[PDB]
Design a protein around this ligand. Structure first.
Ligand SMILES: [Mg+2]
Ligand SMILES: [Mg+2]
Ligand SMILES: [Mg+2]
Ligand SMILES: [Mg+2]
Ligand SMILES: [Mg+2]
Ligand SMILES: [Mg+2]
Ligand SMILES: [Mg+2]
Ligand SMILES: [Mg+2]
Ligand SMILES: [Mg+2]
Ligand SMILES: [Mg+2]
Ligand SMILES: [Mg+2]
Ligand SMILES: [Mg+2]
Ligand SMILES: [Mg+2]
Ligand SMILES: [Mg+2]
Ligand SMILES: [Zn+2]
Lengths: 283, 130, 143, 78, 132
RNA sequence: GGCGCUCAAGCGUGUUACCUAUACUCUACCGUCAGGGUUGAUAUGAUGCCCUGACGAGUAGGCAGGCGUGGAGGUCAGUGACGAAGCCUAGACCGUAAGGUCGGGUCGAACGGCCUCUAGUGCAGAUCUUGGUG
RNA sequence: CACGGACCAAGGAGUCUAACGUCUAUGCGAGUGUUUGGGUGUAAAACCCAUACGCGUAGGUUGGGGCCUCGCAAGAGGUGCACAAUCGACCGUGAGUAAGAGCAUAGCUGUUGGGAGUUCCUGCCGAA
């Protein structure tokens, strides 16, 4: 929930210019909807899916791209990056050579993820190996560009890296295997254009009759809400949290005098009086 | 967002998770103090966190705070525990002052075990030197 | 505190089991002849002197009569016969449990022999061993 | 005849007679996940590991002090 | 009926966790009632329109009460004048949200209502007509 | 039932004693169900941990959870001539079990674990037919 | 024990698809569905526009979960969701109105159908 992100130059030095976050990143992150839509769409390569649900899943994936913990969870080596969501200067769109783009990626700190994808290449295990699906390798960083100026050609050859236009983002590209939080690199122009493409609090989304989804729960963290300050005033005193065992074993009163007295105090006096063996008058 | 992150990591793919035969789960995360995937355990799940981890002969302490959740490159602050075991525990308690007991207890236990491992690998690799 | 506790130490719950002095069987009384069913002197008749705090009965042969010295014997491994001797002659205070961890036996034996002499044939009884002959059924046998 | 009543106690379930739950291990990194749980768990080297890797795993396991269920397997027979 | 929502929505589960904790730790039955409502299926969560909110507030003494709808609220163009209130509900249609904001009212999630009224003080629960 | 029995080891009629079951009682354990405790956070996934109780035959019918077999996406910077996959293994460990892991044998070049969606668990018997053998 | 037995190897008793409906989850919401076409496209895809039509819209009192006051509590009340009860008005004697919920997708699944033997292991609920 930062206000803004700092652009980073291709060489690596942090850029003074800063860009406010778009409203997409503050959107619901729903694994279930993304999973269902991902299954339905992956069956096609057919299942009909509601357009609004599809956009919802896309927004959820985009929001997941900012949560570095989820990106680590999927497997990307985002341990060493300047920050998240990772933004790079717009000049990136105008690179013409693969080697220059790779060097810029090394400066960006995505070297580890690319090395992982390179090492992960292995021969296809199944018989699909001879049905045009022979080599399998892990997924690399995604580079988003507002407009192509030759960056697309440079980064085509390098393994693991896929580029997508801002106006055309894909759930399959954003959330491989129905898993949220793919590592993404946004060009500076792309980061700005995301607002126009998806919309902000006071800006139309540019999609006809579309608004970003609302949150059922205003706060993600339930621990903050449950603790709060006023609830604990409203809450009754707590228990032990590990119940004390009462009556693990049954002690028969007839055989154990202590519990017999506990159940009945008058038994003590009656024992002394021996009323049970009392003598009725002979009369 | 820590609760959301944890719930996704729990009911979806925690890539570092390994499902043992018993059914207990182990996060492979090197920074993880307790190698068991739980609410308190995944460094991914929790913003506030700490660990003892060995680098070379040293047994460093790594700190994680929600403030540096962004910029993951500089997230983990590195602190040198003194070779004296008592001083090391004192430093751990000091740095983990006013810090939830789970991480503190686990951190102390991990430091003890790593110290023992360093001692015993010195044992296995005793050489004629000195 | 030189080692932090690896794993944890589960403290045992407090136990409400207080040891109390033993309640001996009714037959066992000081000055009661006994039959030992195990050990070095199994099947040998002995005299009973006193009950110790650690629940080990103290017995004398006498070593003069049958060669069995002063010794501790467990109560359950012993049969008690109905014949008695008066133990008042022998004082039997000094020797105790910790003492066990010749002259004393002589002092005890003189007093015990003094009472043994009165009853006929008792010395012969204590001298000889006991065993089960064929056709002997213990359950009818009055000891 | 098998049935649920034969089920073993939870506290004793999935326990070898040595008292250690068996955990599969492929490489050194997976071994290191069992660093402190030496009392609760014992490592078991996978069937597909090569002989060169098994000696390294055994050395690291000895250093960590983690019991290996199947040492001297493919380095000795039976 | 149910012991937990059949839905696999993360946020609904979070709200259910919060409200079951409050119901366990609060004497007020309001938390229990809303907890049981959260489990209900779509058919058992009929939409409560802004129209019904207007009627519920017209009842005497309920003008300043916080209306609660465990579910969704839908707009109703039939009305021109709508009073100001701080409705709380799971979801709000764009029309209903605009109507509430326009009339000086405001819409809150159920967690924000829990922070406001842990015991449900001055609350008014409403349920839509489940004719079919 | 068999061997055997005939003042019965054959009957009916009464008496006790004695043997013992998926029956009943108590305890421990395993499962299903129900009622609960537990966050200014738990010394382990609030789908966690813990407490308490009830039940476990069940025909007709119906529901759930696991094991195994392939397909695809993602993932383990997985595994591999210091021997991958496949098959066998009256060997060891685990699980109530379907089975799983390891060891060994065999094998001799690549394949497996894990999250998701998608296909998909072993036998019986008949008409006979064909080859081959009388 | 009572009842039957040439011999070895195999092979070994029919197919895709439709209509209506209950329940559950998700998206939107007096709306809802696009794809009937086009643009765009590291190119069946993915992203986006219209273009239409489909199915929707066009009060009295009592009880009442809940919330407010008083009360330590039982209660005293006050107020009243859904819905019911009867009491009626109006529209046109009910499906009534006097403050609507549906559409779409997916899962499971009942019935009708178009040619149209046993059943991996465990558990659960249970007529007659
Ligand atoms: Mg506690
Ligand atoms: Mg009990
Ligand atoms: Mg093998
Ligand atoms: Mg419907
Ligand atoms: Mg009124
Ligand atoms: Mg018995
Ligand atoms: Mg505990
Ligand atoms: Mg029952
Ligand atoms: Mg039953
Ligand atoms: Mg695969
Ligand atoms: Mg096998
Ligand atoms: Mg067994
Ligand atoms: Mg009314
Ligand atoms: Mg009324
Ligand atoms: Zn984890």
């Amino acid at each position: 929930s930062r206000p803004q992100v700092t652009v980073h130059s291709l060489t690596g030095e942090a850029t003074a210019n800063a860009l406010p976050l778009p409203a997409v990143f503050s959107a619901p992150i729903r694994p279930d909807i993304v999973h269902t839509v991902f299954t339905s769409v992956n069956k096609n390569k057919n299942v009909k899916v509601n357009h609004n649900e599809k956009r919802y899943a896309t927004a959820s994936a985009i929001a997941a791209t900012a949560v570095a913990s989820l990106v680590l969870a999927r497997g990307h080596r985002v341990e060493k990056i300047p920050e998240i969501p990772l933004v790079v200067s717009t000049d990136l769109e105008s690179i013409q050579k693969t080697k220059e783009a790779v060097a810029a990626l090394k400066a960006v700190g995505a070297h580890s993820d690319l090395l992982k994808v390179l090492k992960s290449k292995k021969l296809r295990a199944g018989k699909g190996k001879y049905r045009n699906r022979r080599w399998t390798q892990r997924r690399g960083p995604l580079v988003v560009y507002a407009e192509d100026n030759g960056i697309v050609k440079a980064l085509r050859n390098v393994p693991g890296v896929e580029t997508a236009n801002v106006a055309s983002l894909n759930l399959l590209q954003l959330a491989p295997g129905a898993h949220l939080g793919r590592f993404v690199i946004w060009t500076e122009a792309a980061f700005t254009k995301l607002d126009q493409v998806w919309g902000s609090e006071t800006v139309a989304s540019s999609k006809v009759g579309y608004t970003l989804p609302s949150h059922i729960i205003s706060t993600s963290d339930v621990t903050r809400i449950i603790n709060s300050s006023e609830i604990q005033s409203a809450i009754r005193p707590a228990g032990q949290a590990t119940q004390k065992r009462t009556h693990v074993l049954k002690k028969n009163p007839l055989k154990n005098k202590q519990v017999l007295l506990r159940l009945n105090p008058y038994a003590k006096v009656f024992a002394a009086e021996k009323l049970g063996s009392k003598k009725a008058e002979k009369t | 967002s820590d609760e959301i992150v944890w719930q996704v990591i729990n009911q979806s793919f925690c890539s570092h998770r390994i499902k043992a035969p018993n059914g207990q789960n182990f996060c492979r995360n090197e920074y993880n103090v307790t190698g068991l995937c739980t609410r308190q355990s995944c460094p991914l799940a929790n913003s506030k966190y700490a660990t003892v981890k060995c680098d070379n002969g040293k047994l460093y302490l790594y700190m994680k705070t929600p403030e540096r959740a962004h910029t993951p490159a500089k997230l983990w602050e590195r602190i040198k525990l003194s070779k004296n075991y008592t001083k090391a525990l004192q430093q751990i308690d000091e740095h983990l002052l006013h810090w939830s007991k789970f991480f503190r207890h686990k951190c102390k236990q991990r430091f003890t075990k790593l110290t023992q491992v360093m001692i015993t690998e010195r044992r296995l690799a005793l050489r004629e030197e000195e | 505190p030189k080692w932090y506790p690896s794993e944890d130490v589960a403290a045992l719950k407090k136990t409400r089991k207080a040891a109390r002095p033993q309640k001996l069987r009714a037959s066992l009384v000081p000055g009661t002849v006994l039959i030992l069913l195990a050990g070095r002197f199994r099947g040998k008749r002995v005299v009973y002197l006193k009950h110790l705090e650690d629940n080990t009965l103290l017995i004398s042969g006498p070593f003069k009569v049958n060669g069995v010295p002063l010794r501790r014997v467990n109560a359950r491994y012993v049969i008690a016969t109905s014949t008695k001797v008066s133990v008042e002659g022998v004082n039997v205070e000094k020797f105790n449990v910790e003492y066990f961890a010749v002259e004393d036996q002589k002092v005890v034996d003189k007093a015990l022999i003094a009472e043994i002499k009165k009853t006929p044939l008792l010395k012969q009884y204590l001298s000889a061993s006991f065993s089960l002959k064929n056709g002997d059924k213990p359950h009818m046998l009055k000891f | 005849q098998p049935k649920i009543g034969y089920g073993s106690n939870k506290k004793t379930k999935f326990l070898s007679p040595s008292g250690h739950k068996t955990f599969l291990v492929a490489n050194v990194k997976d071994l290191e996940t069992l660093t402190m749980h030496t009392k609760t768990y014992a490592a078991e080297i996978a069937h597909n590991i090569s002989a060169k890797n098994r000696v390294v795993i055994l050395a690291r396991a000895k250093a960590l002090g983690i019991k290996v269920t199947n040492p001297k397997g493919r380095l000795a027979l039976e | 009926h149910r012991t937990a929502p059949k839905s696999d929505n993360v946020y609904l589960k979070l709200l259910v966790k919060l409200y079951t904790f409050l119901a366990r730790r609060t004497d007020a039955p309001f938390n229990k009632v809303v907890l049981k409502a959260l489990f209900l299926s779509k058919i058992n969560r009929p939409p409560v329109s802004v129209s019904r909110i207007a009627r519920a507030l017209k009842q005497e003494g309920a003008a300043n009460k916080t209306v609660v709808v465990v579910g969704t609220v839908t707009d109703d163009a039939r009305i021109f004048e709508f009073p100001k209130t701080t409705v709380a509900a799971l979801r709000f249609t764009a029309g209903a949200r605009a109507k509430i904001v326009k009339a000086g009212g405001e819409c809150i999630t159920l967690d924000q209502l829990a922070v406001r009224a842990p015991k449900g003080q001055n609350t008014l629960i409403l349920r839509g007509p489940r004719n079919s």
